[PDB]
């Protein structure tokens, strides 16, 4: 069914005889020649150390946030690392993740009992999912948590860690609030799983097109114009001819767009 146009015609009609006429048998396609990867040429490694290896985390009633920006975050050393008992990614696949680009990736860090880390989920209402750390419905981002009994647990009980239990309506996702409202923990090395302190970090990012700043560790390649090429701009992939354009963009916008929601113009990241 690809030897010559006549044999292709026979295959389309499912016959060994073809009557006189004109037949539509296939579709002509030009194939892409090479690949184009264009990422911003920032090179600073990313300070995940000061988040993951912090000496003492914050307590979940007043969970922390750190800005991650202007870094080329190699997420592989995270996913390759074995200490994480729970690396769960929503709306993004962890192996594919390393090639993408982000505009605001946020690290939230707080310590909770190892038993209830399941309540770190988009729904799953509970004493900490409502009054302490409400996780928004259906976001994109990975929740990475680990055991901390070696570090944050005191013989005779560790009471530095507090979680709010309160008597009103839960307010909003991603909002911290500052009978008595604050309950101490009882972290002890004698305590096994359950009542066991787990250190939790949730990386929340957006994966939408805007000028990016936290990209993957992918080397850029020179860009070739006026020929069918397979391009990759900041995680945007496709096939097409790249030409110079007179479309007047504005600093807050990088991506043009078509009526049918396909991309129509890109801004060269460099």
């Amino acid at each position, epitope marked *: 069914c690809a030897l010559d146009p006549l044999s292709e015609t026979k295959c389309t009609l499912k016959s060994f005889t073809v009557e006189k006429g004109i037949y539509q048998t296939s579709n002509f396609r030009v194939q892409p020649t090479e690949s184009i990867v264009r990422f911003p040429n920032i090179t600073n490694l990313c300070p995940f150390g000061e988040v993951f*290896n912090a*000496t003492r985390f914050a307590s979940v009633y007043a969970w922390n946030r750190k800005r991650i920006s202007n870094c080329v975050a190699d997420y592989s050393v995270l996913y390759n690392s074995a200490s994480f008992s729970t690396f769960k990614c929503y709306g993004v696949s962890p192996t594919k993740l390393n090639d993408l680009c982000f505009t605001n990736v946020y690290a939230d860090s707080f310590v909770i009992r190892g038993d209830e880390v399941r309540q770190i989920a988009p729904g799953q209402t509970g004493k900490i999912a409502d009054y302490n750390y409400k996780l928004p419905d259906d976001f994109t981002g990975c929740v990475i948590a680990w055991n901390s009994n070696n570090l944050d647990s*005191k013989v005779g009980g560790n009471y530095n860690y507090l979680y709010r239990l309160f008597r009103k309506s839960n307010l909003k996702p991603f909002e911290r609030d500052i009978y008595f409202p604050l309950q101490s923990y009882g972290f002890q090395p004698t305590n096994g799983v359950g009542y066991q302190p787990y250190r939790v970090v949730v990386l929340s990012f957006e994966l939408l097109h805007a000028p990016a700043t936290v990209c993957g560790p992918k080397k850029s390649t020179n860009l070739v114009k006026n020929k069918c090429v397979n391009f990759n701009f900041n995680g945007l992939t496709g096939t097409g001819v790249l030409t110079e354009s007179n479309k007047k963009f504005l600093p807050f916008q990088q991506f043009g767009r078509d009526i049918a929601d396909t991309t129509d113009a890109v801004r060269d990241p460099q």
Partner: antibody, heavy 120, light 106 residues
Framework: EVQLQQSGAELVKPGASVKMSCKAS????????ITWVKQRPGQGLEWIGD????????KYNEKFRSEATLTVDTSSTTAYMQLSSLTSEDSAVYYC?????????????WGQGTTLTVSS | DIVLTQSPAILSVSPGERVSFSCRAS??????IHWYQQRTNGSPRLLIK???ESVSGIPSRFSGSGSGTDFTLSINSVESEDIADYYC?????????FGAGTKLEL
């Protein structure tokens, strides 16, 4: 009284390792961490690693990822640092120290100054 | 990794007159900073518990200021009794680091 005592002094030909020890006294050995540091005459201090005496855990500096190994004995209320494959660049002054991880994260108690002389 | 650099390499000093040190890191630490001094024998002692406030065990002659990246130490009145070198140090995230060293001399 709250104080950390030091092992003493060694004269050692290069190649032969040293076991070093840190006599804790006068405090709750199970609620304070232990931290080891080393410096050289005319040079500043460098951290090597820490141990939680209450329950087994350890953190190490990368520049001493294999040379230093740290251990503790709660019953004797003492900590130990072992150095392997000593060199003339290991001729250094070592201080044991107390670290209050759960407290203010400070080096509130130290040794009296241990000088390790390595001579070929 | 955090790098802690001390700008005043050497200050020539005379007793009584005001002298001030500063510490410049590579990035934000928060407020978990300490200072240690080394008499010529080599025994350290605590001076600054947290970056801004003096520890309860030190006279109020010593005070700290700044947070995050710019840190400073001031001497209210210097004397030969206070001949010492000050090390900037941080303990917020592993690994624990130390300073470079600043000297006092007549």
């Amino acid at each position: 009284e709250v104080q950390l005592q030091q092992s003493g002094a060694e004269l050692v030909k290069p190649g032969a390792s040293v076991k070093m020890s840190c006599k804790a006294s006068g405090y709750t050995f199970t609620s304070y961490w232990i931290t080891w540091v080393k410096q050289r005459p005319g040079q500043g201090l460098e951290w090597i690693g820490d141990i939680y005496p209450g329950s087994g855990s350890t953190k190490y500096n990368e520049k001493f990822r294999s040379e230093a190994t740290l251990t503790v004995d709660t019953s004797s209320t003492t900590a130990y640092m072992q150095l392997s494959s000593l060199t003339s660049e290991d001729s250094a002054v070592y201080y044991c120290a107390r670290w209050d991880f759960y407290g203010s994260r400070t080096f509130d108690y130290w040794g009296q100054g241990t000088t390790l002389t390595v001579s070929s | 990794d955090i790098v802690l650099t001390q700008s005043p390499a050497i200050l020539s000093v005379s007793p009584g007159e005001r002298v001030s040190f500063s510490c410049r890191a590579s990035q934000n630490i928060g407020t978990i900073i300490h200072w240690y001094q080394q008499r010529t024998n080599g025994s350290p002692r605590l001076l600054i518990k947290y970056a801004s406030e003096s520890v309860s065990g030190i006279p109020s002659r010593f005070s700290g200021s700044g947070s995050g990246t710019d840190f400073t130490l001031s001497i209210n009145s210097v004397e030969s009794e206070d001949i010492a070198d000050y090390y900037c140090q941080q303990s917020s995230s592993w690994p624990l680091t130390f300073g470079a060293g600043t000297k006092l001399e007549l």
